[PDB]
Design an enzyme around this catalytic site. Structure first.
Site, PDB file in Angstrom:
ATOM      1  N   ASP C  51       0.803  -1.238   0.000  1.00  0.00           N
ATOM      2  CA  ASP C  51       0.000   0.000   0.000  1.00  0.00           C
ATOM      3  C   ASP C  51       0.834   1.286   0.000  1.00  0.00           C
ATOM      4  OD1 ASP C  51      -2.853  -0.170  -0.211  1.00  0.00           O
ATOM      5  OD2 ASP C  51      -2.863  -1.236   1.716  1.00  0.00           O
ATOM      6  N   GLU C  82      -4.873   4.482  -0.631  1.00  0.00           N
ATOM      7  CA  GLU C  82      -3.718   3.596  -0.450  1.00  0.00           C
ATOM      8  C   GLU C  82      -2.803   4.041   0.693  1.00  0.00           C
ATOM      9  OE1 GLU C  82      -4.801   1.256  -1.850  1.00  0.00           O
ATOM     10  OE2 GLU C  82      -4.489   1.013  -3.977  1.00  0.00           O
ATOM     11  N   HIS C  86      -5.297   3.227   3.944  1.00  0.00           N
ATOM     12  CA  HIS C  86      -4.944   1.811   4.081  1.00  0.00           C
ATOM     13  C   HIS C  86      -3.636   1.585   4.809  1.00  0.00           C
ATOM     14  CE1 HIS C  86      -7.558   0.730   0.312  1.00  0.00           C
ATOM     15  NE2 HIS C  86      -8.256   1.274   1.292  1.00  0.00           N
ATOM     16  N   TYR C  90      -2.872   0.055   9.186  1.00  0.00           N
ATOM     17  CA  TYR C  90      -2.038  -1.024   9.716  1.00  0.00           C
ATOM     18  C   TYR C  90      -1.253  -0.576  10.926  1.00  0.00           C
ATOM     19  CZ  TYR C  90      -3.024  -3.054   5.114  1.00  0.00           C
ATOM     20  OH  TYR C  90      -3.639  -3.511   3.964  1.00  0.00           O
ATOM     21  N   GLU C 149      -3.371  -5.378  -6.727  1.00  0.00           N
ATOM     22  CA  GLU C 149      -4.689  -5.169  -6.105  1.00  0.00           C
ATOM     23  C   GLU C 149      -5.451  -6.476  -5.832  1.00  0.00           C
ATOM     24  OE1 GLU C 149      -5.965  -2.431  -4.917  1.00  0.00           O
ATOM     25  OE2 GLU C 149      -5.069  -0.725  -5.971  1.00  0.00           O
ATOM     26  N   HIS C 186     -10.812  -1.135  -6.887  1.00  0.00           N
ATOM     27  CA  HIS C 186      -9.576  -0.605  -7.505  1.00  0.00           C
ATOM     28  C   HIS C 186      -9.065  -1.532  -8.606  1.00  0.00           C
ATOM     29  CE1 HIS C 186      -8.214   1.847  -3.699  1.00  0.00           C
ATOM     30  NE2 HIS C 186      -9.451   2.116  -4.069  1.00  0.00           N
TER      31      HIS C 186
END
Ligand SMILES: Nc1ncnc2c1ncn2[C@@H]1O[C@H](COP(=O)(O)OP(=O)(O)OP(=O)(O)O)[C@@H](O)[C@H]1O
Ligand SMILES: Cc1cn([C@H]2C[C@H](O)[C@@H](COP(=O)(O)OP(=O)(O)OP(=O)(O)O)O2)c(=O)[nH]c1=O
Ligand SMILES: Cc1cn([C@H]2C[C@H](O)[C@@H](COP(=O)(O)OP(=O)(O)OP(=O)(O)O)O2)c(=O)[nH]c1=O
Ligand SMILES: [Mg+2]
Ligand SMILES: [Mg+2]
Ligand SMILES: [Mn+2]
Ligand SMILES: [Mn+2]
Ligand SMILES: [Mn+2]
Ligand SMILES: [Mn+2]
Lengths: 683, 287, 287, 683
Positions: C51, C82, C86, C90, C149, C186
């Site tokens: 990402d 991204e 995303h 994390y 993706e 995506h």
């Protein structure tokens, strides 16, 4: 761009490879002739000016009512007779931008330097015309500079308090915490800096009314205090500044230190609160031996022994706390904590370091209390007693807070006039008057301690300036010899003036009989040791001035034993930043940071050479960052041996220095008897 | 010291065009004179055209050359706002107020306009001149970007804010206020990235970068004065718009850590109403 | 025929990790074996890397080369997701579950892991090989992006889904499902753009492009097998994950308009279980 | 997964197309037999259990000592004589996880439901054994439910305050702000929600001591309050909750609302402070006419008129303020402000809306003061008088701060037992006892107002449950007819009990003579209008109960005129959040949010069907989000005509409703007499 500013900027324009220092006199003359005289209100006579100032709510009429107008005119003539001229543009600019009284619209100038000096002298004299003239001569000669609060506010109706430094003890209870917040807000509303001792608060995870893990620790109170100081930011003219002190053995020490980490979360991070650490000799001993150390939960200790952890002798009670099963403690690495302090000071300059045993091994009022923390500038070291604020409709147990009104001797001017005794005694009188006329009606402990202890702080400035203008290196042994002799004389004459005031008023400070002054233990080193200059060059600097001998110190000791002392504390060297420009002096006793100071005022950049700077004394005006911090520590320790309170000691570090170098400087300062370390400034 | 804080402020300001209903503007639009409608259309097209350059080139080019994952993320977010939110918002305002043929003609006019083109191409020229691994060229582009975000937009923003402060065209004025609030933070953020580069330079190089910034500001400012008279003389507002340009030029300079260039002026009250760790070695304890 | 509906879908799917409180996973995390926690951390770290590059490089570079303001707006929005949404999520998961040292160690582990470096080298290499006005280099990068993706993420996604399906780590799992929902759209969108370019080619050129796509898939696949074994052998799941990545490889091919390449297999059923403002009018004040 | 959780989760497993509602009785039976009977501390007899509880600092011995052990045994036998059974798993789970007394280690259950009820009854009776038995019957029948504070803490040594709702007036001064922060922390420490009125604080940009642009506005005080409430988190299990109320005509209203915007800067965001807005009829009139409105700087008004802006009638003073040059005001768009309020309520559910004129046109104690703000739950509407907290050593001018202890009638159980009068009178007696036994040691105004006003809040719950279990739609006219009759009877009997208490004790509430009760203006509608049910179906529900007529209200009016009224306030409908599960009743008078409530406790999820939910009455248990909010407003306004205080009124909005729909709902509520709007809940 103003003409005077263009003249000043010509300072940096090198001519014949040399700075055009004479351009500053032209710059100041142009500044005056083109701005100050134009924007100075015109009054036909002094009587009309005084009437206009009193009626228009500019001056307090009460203090001016103690003099016949003839005496006021004589005092003003005395101030004006000197024909004082500012030697540099920055001095006059600072005075007329910060301290000169201006109309309510801040458009015209109502006070000149002479007018402010005369008003301050009349306020000090309290109805004595000859005393007012003496004060006028002292200030116009610039031998003594009252602190910024006193200098700015004396004799003004719409003024803040003349005392600007307060220290608050906080007891371990919600009532005490709320009262501490209220008092801090009240004192910051007055413009004074507030330092709070958080060592009596229980650590995070302690029980609140037999319910465990209920306490938020000192960090929650720190957030409360930070928001309180941000709210009471002096009407926005000066952000509220407060300091929090925590003993190194407090369990919250790591959380307390983490509030100043840049990476700290905004929830824990405290933005406007300065932090200082109180390090007993026990912590330094543990770190030296690399032994595992323990940080204690204060409430467990209080329950086990009935006293607060910071009210007990750590050097003696540490092993007992470690061996007591009913005392909760957390294992720590003392050297890791020292290195964390060094790294935090390198990154942000915090925390302030107070060496508790250095402060208290010479503390004259340990019977009243040990010194547990310092102020927001780290030069106030006095005994305090915590107050017990109870529930509404109950009686509060008011303790002793800390506050001292400051004044600075101009070392260069005092030495040039050979008036150490007279200047010191007059400054002591003025500081005593300021303390007597001060009354804070929202800080009961502060008011009670001001009335009981009568503490004053008489500082000094222009040490580096005076030494450089006399061809003496700041780091040289001759400079330390001069500092030793000068501050011994200052201490001698301040003690003599305190004893004389006690005899005249027939009253000492509360609990004087138990002090080291009363028992004579204070004068041991003065009666057994000589402090006259050991270098002929330094001894010549004192020609025409009597240097007190061992016999003089014995006579002073006998006089104090017969009459006592009026002031519990007399001397403290505060940073003295803003008024150093007006005095044309180097700030405090610290070495100069830069030979020429580059400042930005609006869109115009101003150049300020160090006072007295020239080609022939360029080498002696060595910058602080280039000096050996060990030699600066030696100088401050030489001075500190004659100061009953602390010295605001800033460390000037190069960017190449590691945390190990900062730790070594701290350990040498602790070894050399340094009491507090103010800031870690990096270049 | 600042990227995570700006991340937070950026994402919490997220909004979408659909949130503001535009149709109720027709109830005040119909009451404006031809000159007022003409100026508004031209200003709007000016803002639209400049903001497109920022979305297609300005933000993405800076995101490309700046090092740091968190900075790239914030910059990506800002580029997204230009292309996905601001551009759609300007289009929505246009489609509400003018028929298709009128929109096409206004854009044809503003596309040919000398003062709009001069500033648009000056900014784009600096973005195109960025060179890989050359922080000086990046700084120059950042200065251009800050000047667009914090200064060049404001000769345009003036008019919607002027109406908004009077109770006219309130729906589109609300949209413009949200856009402007985004551009303000964009300008501050890019300004901090430029100061970071500036602070890494020598004293001579700094003086040279200051001269660049002031020279660029002067060129743009003199063109803004002409742009302003060209649009606002017909509605009698140019004097006050000029004060607003200088006030915003000073903000742009402050974003770049520079002193204000222009004297302080009061702004039109209607527009205001609209607005090195090393360890101890056991010998450091002995002396 | 499709960009507008993708624009609307992307913006309506907008989310931030802070919307999901993560302290609820604290206990089910504490209860996992050391092997399970290790694999989980590493899996999410591998996802973070993908990402990071998709947001910093892949999506912005494709946006630069694709024509049309609306297509660019969709691609810019996807780029923001991204790296601003995303990749950051994390870290929210890591900061909740793991101590700083374990977090530091796993990011050091991504730098030195040969399979993760190889896959990044291959994908980013293709992104950086795009030549302006050269549709073939663009197609190759879009194939790489679809493979990232719709295929490469899935060796990572398996494990959060595997736990979610057992009622474990469900808050982290909710974040992952939102990420997966985004990547699915995506992959479809970029797939449609790739097909546009492919459909312009001669039959001979098409045959070469299929060869490129299949060769690239096989090369990535062989590397992913080794990566999968390296991560999952210690938790006993490598064979199961391999079936899952083959399943998703077929979906990636389909997104590119190609026939499935791997035979169908039964996937772990646990993993399958893991899957306005309007103004007030005058009449509004009367009743 | 425990067996009871498995049985409860079988509720959602549809069998034969219908939910298995009978699994909840099995779920609760298994829960008891396998967890509660096992984990219940065993005592041989009541004497041993009581001795253990008193000795171990569980039960206060003060209230138990008033009864001979025979009386306590008889009361406990009365509690157990009912053989009370929890009808659903959730009720017993809630009781034994929140209110049941558990050992200090929280591993065993010391109190059953009967033991808790008996202890509460003994606490209420204050030595009256027959009164205690009546209380035991009232609570075991679940006709009356004491509020969570009273129910949980009654008779407990560790117990906190039995009152949990506090309203504080803040005066415009630093002393008053500090005192407000202290009192808020003190009351949060007790676990009670604290609501503050910030309308008296001067707006941002106002002068402090003839120094302009110095005040920070209400947002700085709000930051201080937010930090104070965050610090006093009550062990952290329940985060400190505070509400700030601001008048819509305050200058800082826009900044006050901006603190709740998600886009707001973190230095302005107030995370832990709920915000309510007080909207006079003048603002609604200005928005209706689309006229430009002004927000005023409160200190300018106070200086011009010597009274606070929120102490004046805005409907009479708005034009004077606008026309007065000495009053500072800035223009706003009232419709834009209403739209902003709707948008903020949609985004975050804030602010609470108080319609000041709706509250004060029926307020009985306007002579004491008008209702200027509400509490954290938006249903407390009482007269308050601000306090004047002066400097230390200066006497404070203690005003009146609002507080009330809460209780809820169970409408379903009160109607089933046909005991409206007896239940209301017993609840009034228990609330009066709780009020008389409360003494706040750090809230002088709260304690003084509790002594003087004797305000109590008697709410109701299970309105929707009762209606659905009787074949009546919540929005139907029959539901409003029943609510009208029932709450008219409740008001009648609470007034009768208050008058009887005043007659027995010989005292009324302070300043009762100037109230509308004393002059008889309160009883105008009751003596002129008949409130008997207009539908035969509703009239049948009241069969066996005497519905007061106009003659009965005339007699009660004469009785009050003769003897006065003991309580200044009697009725308020609080949310009744968690105690509704124990009573197996719907929350307050609001419609149910969900037919079956799915919640996750620990790592197992539980399902709670609405009490009495079944296939036959499934359609009558319509969810609030599916309801016409206009009909909900109609029902609440029907109830509100018999409640002297407010009603916590949550708005249940679908995601498809625009801000215009919310604005129309608020405007209809204001039109229909709604006093406050609590929350905007969106599905
Ligand atoms: N739903 C319930 N609510 C409250 N207490 C319960 C409930 N179910 C069981 N109990 C408690 O558990 C005890 C055992 O329950 P159980 O149904 O087995 O009793 P029993 O022997 O059939 O007779 P009884 O109902 O008279 O107690 C009950 O006496 C009561 O104390
Ligand atoms: C009330 C409260 C106290 N504290 C901390 C601050 C105080 O230093 C400390 C003691 O609070 P106290 O006000 O002294 O509480 P207490 O006296 O009733 O309890 P105890 O008998 O144990 O002294 O607890 C919190 O952290 N949060 C809180 O909410
Ligand atoms: C002291 C102080 C007050 N205030 C606000 C809070 C109070 O509501 C308001 C009044 O402060 P006060 O404490 O009442 O100040 P004052 O009474 O001495 O001055 P004045 O008579 O002109 O009011 O000012 C600040 O915002 N910041 C501050 O630092
Ligand atoms: Mg205590
Ligand atoms: Mg006041
Ligand atoms: Mn834009
Ligand atoms: Mn922008
Ligand atoms: Mn992604
Ligand atoms: Mn993606």
């Amino acid at each position: 761009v103003p003409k005077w500013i263009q003249l000043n900027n010509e300072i940096m324009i090198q001519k014949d490879g040399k700075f055009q220092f004479d351009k500053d006199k032209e710059a100041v003359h142009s500044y005056f002739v083109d701005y100050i005289n134009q924007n100075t209100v015109f009054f036909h006579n002094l009587k009309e000016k005084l009437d206009y100032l009193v009626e228009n709510q500019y001056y307090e009429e009460e203090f001016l009512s103690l003099y016949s107008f003839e005496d006021i005119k004589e005092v003003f003539k005395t101030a004006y007779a000197k024909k004082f001229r500012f030697p540099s543009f920055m001095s006059a600019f600072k005075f007329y931008n910060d301290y000169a009284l201006k109309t309510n619209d801040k458009k015209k100038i109502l006070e000149r330097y002479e007018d402010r000096i005369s008003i301050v002298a009349l306020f000090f004299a309290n109805g004595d015309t000859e005393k007012a003239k003496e004060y006028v001569n002292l200030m116009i000669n610039q031998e003594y500079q009252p602190s910024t609060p006193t200098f700015l506010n004396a004799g003004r109706k719409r003024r803040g308090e003349l005392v600007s430094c307060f220290l608050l003890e906080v007891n371990d209870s919600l009532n005490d915490i709320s009262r501490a917040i209220d008092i801090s807000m009240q004192l910051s509303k007055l413009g004074g800096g507030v330092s709070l001792n958080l060592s009596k608060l229980r650590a995070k995870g302690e029980a609140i009314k037999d319910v465990e893990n209920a306490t938020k620790g000192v960090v929650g109170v720190m957030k409360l205090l930070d928001n309180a100081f941000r709210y009471a930011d002096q009407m926005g003219q000066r952000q509220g500044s407060g300091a929090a002190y925590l003993n190194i053995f407090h369990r919250d020490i790591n959380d307390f230190l983490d509030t100043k980490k840049i990476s700290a979360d905004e929830d824990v991070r405290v933005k406007t609160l300065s932090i200082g650490v109180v390090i007993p000799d026990k912590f330094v001993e543990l770190a030296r031996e690399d032994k595992a150390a323990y940080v204690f939960y204060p409430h467990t200790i209080y329950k086990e022994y009935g006293q607060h952890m910071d009210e007990m002798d750590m050097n003696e009670m540490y092993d007992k706390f470690v061996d007591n099963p009913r005392v909760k403690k957390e294992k720590i690495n003392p050297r890791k904590l020292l290195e964390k302090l060094a790294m935090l000071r390198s990154e942000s300059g915090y925390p302030y370091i107070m060496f508790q045993d250095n402060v208290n091994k010479v503390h004259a009022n340990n019977h009243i209390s040990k010194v547990k923390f310092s102020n927001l500038c780290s030069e106030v070291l006095q005994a305090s007693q915590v107050s017990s604020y109870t529930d509404y409709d109950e009686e509060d147990e008011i303790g002793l807070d800390i506050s001292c009104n400051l004044g600075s001797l101009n070392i260069l001017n005092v030495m040039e006039h050979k008036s150490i005794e007279k200047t010191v005694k007059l400054a002591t009188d003025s500081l005593t008057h300021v303390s007597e006329t001060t009354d804070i009606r929202n800080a009961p402990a502060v008011r009670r301690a001001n009335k009981a202890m009568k503490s004053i702080g008489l500082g000094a400035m222009n040490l580096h300036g005076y030494l450089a203008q006399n061809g003496i290196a700041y780091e040289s042994p001759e400079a330390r010899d001069f500092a030793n002799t000068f501050f011994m004389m200052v201490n001698f004459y301040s003690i003599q003036r305190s004893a004389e005031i006690a005899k005249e008023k027939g009253e000492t400070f509360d609990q004087y009989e138990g002090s080291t002054y009363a028992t004579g233990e204070y004068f041991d080193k003065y009666v057994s040791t000589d402090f006259s200059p050991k270098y002929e060059k330094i001894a010549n600097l004192f020609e025409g001035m009597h240097i007190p001998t061992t016999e003089d110190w014995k006579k002073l000791k006998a006089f104090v034993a017969e009459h006592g002392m009026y002031h519990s504390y007399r001397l403290c060297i505060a940073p003295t930043g803003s008024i150093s420009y007006v005095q044309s002096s180097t700030a405090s006793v610290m070495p100069i940071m830069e030979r020429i100071e580059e400042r930005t005022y609006g869109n115009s950049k101003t150049y300020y050479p160090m006072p007295g700077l020239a080609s022939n004394n360029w080498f002696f005006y060595k910058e602080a960052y280039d000096m050996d911090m060990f030699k600066v520590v030696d100088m401050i320790a030489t001075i500190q041996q004659h100061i009953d309170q602390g010295i605001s000691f800033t460390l000037f570090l190069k960017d190449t220095m590691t945390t190990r170098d900062l730790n070594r400087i701290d350990l040498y300062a602790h070894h050399r008897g340094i009491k507090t370390i103010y800031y870690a400034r990096t270049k | 010291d600042f990227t995570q804080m700006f991340y937070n402020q950026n994402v919490k300001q997220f909004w979408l065009p659909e949130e503001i209903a535009l149709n109720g503007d027709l109830l005040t639009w119909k009451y404006l004179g031809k000159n007022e409608q003409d100026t508004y259309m031209k200003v709007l097209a000016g803002l639209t055209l400049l903001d497109t350059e920022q979305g297609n080139t300005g933000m993405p080019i800076v995101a490309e050359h700046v090092d740091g994952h968190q900075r790239k993320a914030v910059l990506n977010f800002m580029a997204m706002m230009e292309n996905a939110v601001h551009a759609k918002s300007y289009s929505n305002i246009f489609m509400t107020l003018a028929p298709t043929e009128t929109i096409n003609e206004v854009f044809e006019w503003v596309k040919q306009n000398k003062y709009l083109q001069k500033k648009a191409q000056m900014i784009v020229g600096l973005y195109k001149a960025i060179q890989k691994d050359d922080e000086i060229s990046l700084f120059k582009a950042m200065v251009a970007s800050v000047y667009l975000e914090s200064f060049l937009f404001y000769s345009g923003f003036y008019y919607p804010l002027y109406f908004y402060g009077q109770g006219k065209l309130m729906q589109s004025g609300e949209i413009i206020n949200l856009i402007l609030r985004d551009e303000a933070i964009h300008g501050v953020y890019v300004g901090l990235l430029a100061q970071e580069i500036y602070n890494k330079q020598t004293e001579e190089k700094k003086a040279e970068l200051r001269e660049f910034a002031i020279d660029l500001l002067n060129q743009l400012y003199e063109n803004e004065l002409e742009y302003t008279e060209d649009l606002y003389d017909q509605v009698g507002l140019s004097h006050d718009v000029k004060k607003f340009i200088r006030y915003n030029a000073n903000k742009a300079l402050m974003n770049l850590g520079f002193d204000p260039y222009f004297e302080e002026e009061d702004i039109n009250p209607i527009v205001l109403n609209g607005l090195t760790v090393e360890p101890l070695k056991d010998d450091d304890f002995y002396f």
